[PDB]
Amino acid sequence: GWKTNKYGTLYKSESASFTPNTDIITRTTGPFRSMPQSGVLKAGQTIHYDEVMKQDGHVWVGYTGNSGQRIYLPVRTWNKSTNTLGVLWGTIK
């Protein structure tokens, strides 16, 4: 199951470490590609996430940055019509 918020984002807690195999643009504010860029997570780097979201065509993970701000990044596609996931863009440990 998933919790749901006022933007219709499906979300819950999950804690793991994600290492992308390609550069990924990270977002502030929320799990949408239209949100501002926080930075770039380079292939091979690792973030430790505490939240997972289904929104805007993707599964996103959320973490807290060094400035105390929330950061959001997409790790694979999510087709809401079928609840089908795409290939993971890296590895999770």
Partner: peptide, 5 residues
């Protein structure tokens, strides 16, 4: 939770 938008 789940951020904003």
């Amino acid at each position: 939770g789940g951020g904003g938008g």
